[PDB]
C-alpha cells in the first residue's frame, strides 16, 4: 500500500492567501532535532483539495505545502533547483547536495507528523504563519 505508507515527516504549511510559498535562499528548512546540518535541504510540494461548498458548488480549499528532504518523496528524482510548478526548493547554506537516503519519508503507522516549525526570524510570504 505504497501511497498510504508514505507521507511528509512534517505537518503542512497552509496557504491562507493568494501568494504561493517561497523562501529566501538559505531559509525554509523545517526544524528537525533528528537531522544534522548536512541534511538541511529539500522541497515543498503543493497539494490542493476540493469539496462541496455550502451553496452546492465545488470549491477549492486553501492549498497545503508539504516538505520532503532532497531525493525523497513524490519528487525524489528531481535534482535540487529543478523547475516544476508546485515545487519550491529550500536549503541551509552548506547542506550536502545528496539524496537523504537515511531519512526517507514517514509511515503514519509508525510515526505521527512533526509539527512544522521554522527558526525565529524566517521570512514567510503573506498568508503563511508558523
Amino acid at each position, epitope marked *: 500500500a505504497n501511497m498510504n505508507n508514505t507521507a511528509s515527516w512534517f505537518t503542512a504549511l497552509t496557504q491562507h492567501g493568494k501568494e504561493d510559498l517561497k523562501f529566501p*535562499r*538559505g531559509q525554509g528548512v523545517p526544524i528537525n532535532t533528528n537531522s544534522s546540518p548536512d541534511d538541511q*535541504i529539500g522541497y515543498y510540494r503543493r497539494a490542493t483539495r476540493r469539496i462541496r461548498g455550502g451553496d452546492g458548488k465545488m470549491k477549492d480549499l486553501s492549498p497545503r505545502w508539504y516538505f520532503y528532504y532532497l*531525493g525523497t518523496g513524490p519528487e*525524489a*528524482g*528531481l*535534482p*535540487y533547483g529543478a523547475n516544476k510548478d508546485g515545487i519550491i526548493w529550500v*536549503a541551509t*547554506e*552548506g*547542506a*550536502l*547536495n*545528496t*539524496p537523504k*537516503d537515511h531519512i526517507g519519508t514517514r509511515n503514519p503507522a509508525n510515526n505521527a507528523a512533526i509539527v512544522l516549525q521554522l527558526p525565529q526570524g524566517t521570512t514567510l510570504p503573506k498568508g503563511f504563519y508558523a
Partner: antibody
Framework: EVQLVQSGAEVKKPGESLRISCKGS????????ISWVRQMPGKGLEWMGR????????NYSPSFQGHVTISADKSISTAYLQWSSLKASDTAMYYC???????????????????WGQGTTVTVSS | AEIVLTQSPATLSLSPGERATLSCRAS??????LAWYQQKPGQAPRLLIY???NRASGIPARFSGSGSGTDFTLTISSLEPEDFAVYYC?????????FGGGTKVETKR
C-alpha cells in the same frame, strides 16, 4: 585561482610504506571533499575513496579498503594517501581532486570532481 | 561494483568538424547525479558537465550533456582538433562512486 598541487614522483620497492600528499590553495579546504583516483598505465580512471576534511569522515572503494589510508590536515589544507605495503601492481598515476558536494551561495557549485591535481606517479619495483 | 557505468562505443572515429555523440548507461538509476570528464593525452582529467546537463565554467559551448535515470549522452556539436581525447562518465548517486570505462575519440582516416 583554485588549485591542488600534488607531491612529486615516487620510486619505491615492494613492501615499503609510502604517503603522498595534495595541497589546496585559493579556496576553503574544509568546505569541499577530497577524492583520490588511480589510473594504471594505459587504463581508465578508478575511484579509490574520499575524505571530508571538515570532520575527517572517509569512505573507500571496496577494492582499496584496507590497502590504503586517506587522511587530511585541514589546518594546512593538505590531504594524504598512504600505503602500508606497496605492491608492484600499485605502479600507477594517482590524482587527487576536489569533490564539490555542498550548497554554497557565493558561487555556482560544480557538483562533482571540479578541480584536479596534476597527478603523482608511483613506480614500485624491486 | 554497485552502480556500474557502461560507455559506448569504446572508440569513436571521427574527423574535426563532425558531430560526436557519446553514451553512458547506468545499471540502476542515478537520477541526475552524473558527470562527464575529458582527459587529453599526458594531462589530468577535466570536468566538462556536472549533474547530467550543466556545463562547467570555461568549457566551450559545443559541449552539452543530457539524460536522467539510466541513459546519458555527451554531445560535441562540431569537433575541434583539441577534442580528440578520452571521455569518462562518473556517478555520485551512491557509494562507491564509480567511473565508466571511457570512450576514446580518435581521428578517422
Amino acid at each position: 585561482e583554485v588549485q591542488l598541487v600534488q607531491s612529486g614522483a615516487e620510486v619505491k620497492k615492494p613492501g615499503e610504506s609510502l604517503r603522498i600528499s595534495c595541497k589546496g590553495s585559493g579556496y576553503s579546504f574544509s568546505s569541499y571533499w577530497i577524492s583520490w583516483v588511480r589510473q594504471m598505465p594505459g587504463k581508465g580512471l578508478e575511484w579509490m575513496g574520499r575524505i571530508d576534511p571538515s570532520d575527517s569522515n572517509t569512505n573507500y572503494s571496496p577494492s582499496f579498503q584496507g590497502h590504503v589510508t586517506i587522511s587530511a590536515d585541514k589546518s594546512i589544507s593538505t590531504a594524504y594517501l598512504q600505503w602500508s605495503s606497496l605492491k608492484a601492481s600499485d605502479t600507477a598515476m594517482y590524482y587527487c581532486a576536489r569533490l564539490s558536494v555542498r550548497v554554497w551561495f557565493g558561487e555556482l557549485p560544480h557538483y562533482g570532481m571540479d578541480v584536479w591535481g596534476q597527478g603523482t606517479t608511483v613506480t614500485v619495483s624491486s | 561494483a554497485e552502480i556500474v557505468l557502461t560507455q559506448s562505443p569504446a572508440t569513436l572515429s571521427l574527423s574535426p568538424g563532425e558531430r560526436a555523440t557519446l553514451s553512458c548507461r547506468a545499471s540502476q538509476s542515478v537520477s541526475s547525479y552524473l558527470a562527464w570528464y575529458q582527459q587529453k593525452p599526458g594531462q589530468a582529467p577535466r570536468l566538462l558537465i556536472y549533474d547530467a546537463s550543466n556545463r562547467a565554467s570555461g568549457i566551450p559551448a559545443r559541449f552539452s550533456g543530457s539524460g536522467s535515470g539510466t541513459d546519458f549522452t555527451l554531445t560535441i556539436s562540431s569537433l575541434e582538433p583539441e577534442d580528440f581525447a578520452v571521455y569518462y562518465c562518473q556517478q555520485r548517486r551512491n557509494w562507491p562512486l564509480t567511473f565508466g570505462g571511457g570512450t576514446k575519440v580518435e581521428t578517422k582516416r
